[PDB]
Ligand binder design. Structure first.
Ligand SMILES: [Zn+2]
Ligand SMILES: [Zn+2]
Ligand SMILES: [Zn+2]
Length: 635
């Protein structure tokens, strides 16, 4: 029977043996300090004959007489200075400051629910209240793992499998106390057809059937470092509020229960500061820890979907710091800082954010798949089913994270959802490059379909492929696709090698203006080393509008494709002969920058004769300069 320095028990209430000693001594009407002086005079710890009430905790309590002490009169709790041993279970965490909600006095007459909730919080409606994040560290009977399951003080959902379990003895915690913190509990009384809404308080407790703590002062619940009381019901749900809650920094309530001592030490090192130091270690990435912290600042899931669109370090810094409770840094890991970069489990008292978006984020990145050598498409269908169950915005949220920013995760449900789309993305990617999907290119999509048969084994490779392609800067140069000068992972190198092999097999020989070029032949289109897709456009002399000599070929060859914003000095076109030689400097990569010249028709091909040099560039049907650079052997 451990007590605090005020001889009160671990539940925050007085003991019967001490009330009896004070009663027989005539000290019941005395103040707390006067009563303590008496109790200590009578040997304190040994004031009882059959008990040794070792002092385990130090608390700061109001002067109210010992008999009137409750958890609601505590302001500070810590381990007693001279207590050498492990902390027993205590209603509040150690080294915490306890806050209470002082009910407001209303001036106007209100209905039962709105009157009571508006005394607790200054809200216009229950829609302005925030459901608290309550979690319990307990075994999931459906699976066998032990983790922090999220729910309320009656039941919780296991994030790995999505099933519900009843709360059991273990470490409990409430997350960061939100504004207008409430807990919504299913109210059988309102669903019981024999009771219905507008039930009495006694009926509520009898129908609820949960194990409250019964005291002369009412029925309360102690969970996760908070003491909850019942306020009222609305929409057939019961509302509990944290009449009293601990604060260990950043408005976190800490951990109580078995094992809470070590957990609280880990929280205090990080949160027990005037300002919480959030330190991004290495490159900024939208991992689970960043997503959950940012989600904590969203009003709704859909607001978060928009918020993450194009998320970068700066936007994250500004949004998080705007509340004034955090300071965001980046660089090397620091001792005592909230170091983000190494991946850690998101199911802990830390990251226990109560926002709507945060709950969606936590669910999305915590679910597992029942993987049994299933194909990617089967896994995707399962992943989508899971994601839809979490939230109707869950797919759009992931889409935004993966395609507008830089998303990272090892969650198989998210990976399966995205990976199954690599075929559709690849089809669009090939369409963007070549204009469509050709039979010569389909083998690229057949390869992905074959890899889908590997199931989980291909999720990481597909992830990297989707990530790269989603934000790639690819261009086709002759028979090879090249990328920007970035490091390419082995899984992405493999994807591009097989794509380029299928393309090298199509590297045919074409003639443009008499010149031999190595170019892809995918059907009606071709690609040259000029870094673009072109078609052969043939028009009659009279159809071009050129001031062509009558000795020119009847048919004039143009290259239809991407062009440069160049200008033509004159409509006059020179009729000239020569041996056109392609250059390795396409797309105006030559030293010459006039971007103007005189048209010339060489072997039926229209080129612009670049001013003040001897280089030529092919013209498109619209008389704009293309990326195909030529010269003439001998001038
Ligand atoms: Zn005793
Ligand atoms: Zn489970
Ligand atoms: Zn009710």
């Amino acid at each position: 029977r451990y007590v605090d320095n005020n001889f009160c028990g671990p539940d925050g209430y007085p003991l019967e043996c001490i009330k009896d000693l004070l009663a027989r001594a005539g000290k019941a009407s005395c103040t707390l300090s006067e009563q303590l002086d008496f109790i200590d005079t009578k040997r304190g710890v040994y004031c009882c004959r059959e008990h040794e009430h070792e002092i385990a905790w130090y608390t700061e309590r109001s002067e109210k007489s010992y008999e009137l002490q409750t958890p609601f009169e505590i302001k500070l709790a810590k381990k007693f200075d001279t207590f050498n041993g492990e902390c027993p279970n205590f209603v509040f965490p150690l080294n915490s400051i306890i806050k209470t909600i002082q009910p407001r006095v209303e001036k106007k007459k209100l209905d039962g629910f709105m009157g009571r909730i508006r005394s607790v919080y200054p809200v216009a409606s229950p829609n302005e209240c925030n459901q608290m994040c309550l979690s319990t560290l307990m075994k999931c009977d459906h699976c066998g793992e032990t983790s922090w399951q999220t729910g309320d003080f009656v039941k919780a959902t296991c994030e790995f499998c999505g099933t519900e379990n009843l709360t059991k003895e273990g470490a409990t915690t409430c997350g960061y106390l939100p504004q207008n913190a409430v807990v919504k509990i299913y109210c059988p009384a309102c669903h019981n057809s024999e009771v219905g809404p507008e039930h009495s308080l006694a009926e509520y407790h009898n129908e609820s059937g949960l194990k409250t703590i019964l005291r002369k002062g009412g029925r309360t619940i102690a969970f996760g470092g908070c003491v909850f009381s019942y306020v009222g019901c609305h929409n057939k749900c019961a509302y509990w509020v944290p009449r009293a809650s601990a604060n260990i920094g950043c408005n976190h309530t800490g951990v109580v229960g078995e094992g809470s001592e070590g957990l609280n030490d880990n929280l205090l090192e990080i949160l027990q500061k005037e300002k919480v130091n959030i330190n991004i270690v290495g490159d900024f990435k939208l991992n689970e820890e960043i997503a959950i912290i940012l989600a904590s600042f969203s009003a709704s899931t859909s607001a978060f979907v928009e918020t993450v669109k194009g998320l970068d370090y700066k936007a994250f810094k500004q949004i998080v710091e705007s509340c004034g409770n955090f300071k965001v840094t980046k660089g090397k890991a620091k001792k005592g800082a909230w170091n983000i970069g190494e991946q850690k489990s998101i199911l802990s008292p830390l990251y226990a954010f109560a926002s709507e978006a945060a709950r969606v984020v936590r669910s999305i990145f915590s679910r597992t798949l029942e993987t049994a050598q299933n194909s990617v498409r089967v896994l995707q269908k399962a992943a989508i089913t899971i994601l839809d169950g979490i939230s109707q915005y869950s797919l759009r949220l992931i889409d935004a994270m993966m395609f507008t920013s830089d998303l990272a995760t090892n969650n198989l449900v998210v990976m399966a959802y995205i990976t199954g789309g690599v075929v559709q993305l690849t089809s669009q990617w090939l369409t963007n490059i070549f204009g469509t999907v050709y039979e010569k290119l389909k083998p690229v999509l057949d390869w992905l379909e074959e890899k889908f048969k590997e199931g989980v084994e291909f999720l990481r490779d597909g992830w990297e492929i989707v990530k790269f392609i989603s934000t790639c800067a690819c261009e086709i140069v002759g028979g090879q696709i090249v990328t920007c000068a970035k490091e390419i992972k082995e899984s992405v190198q493999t994807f591009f090698k097989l794509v380029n092999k299928f393309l090298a097999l199509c590297a045919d020989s074409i003639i443009i203006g008499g010149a031999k070029l190595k170019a892809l032949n995918l059907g009606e289109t071709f690609v040259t080393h000029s870094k673009g897709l072109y078609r052969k456009c043939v028009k009659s002399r009279e159809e071009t509008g050129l001031l062509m000599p009558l000795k020119a070929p009847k048919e004039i060859i143009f290259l239809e494709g991407e062009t440069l914003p160049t200008e033509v000095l004159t409509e006059e076109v020179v009729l000239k002969t020569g041996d056109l030689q392609p250059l390795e400097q396409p797309t105006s990569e030559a030293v010459e920058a006039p971007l103007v010249g005189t048209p010339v028709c060489i072997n039926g091909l229209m080129l612009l004769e670049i001013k003040d040099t001897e280089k030529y560039c092919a013209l498109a049907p619209n008389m704009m300069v293309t990326n195909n650079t030529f010269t003439l052997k001998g001038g």
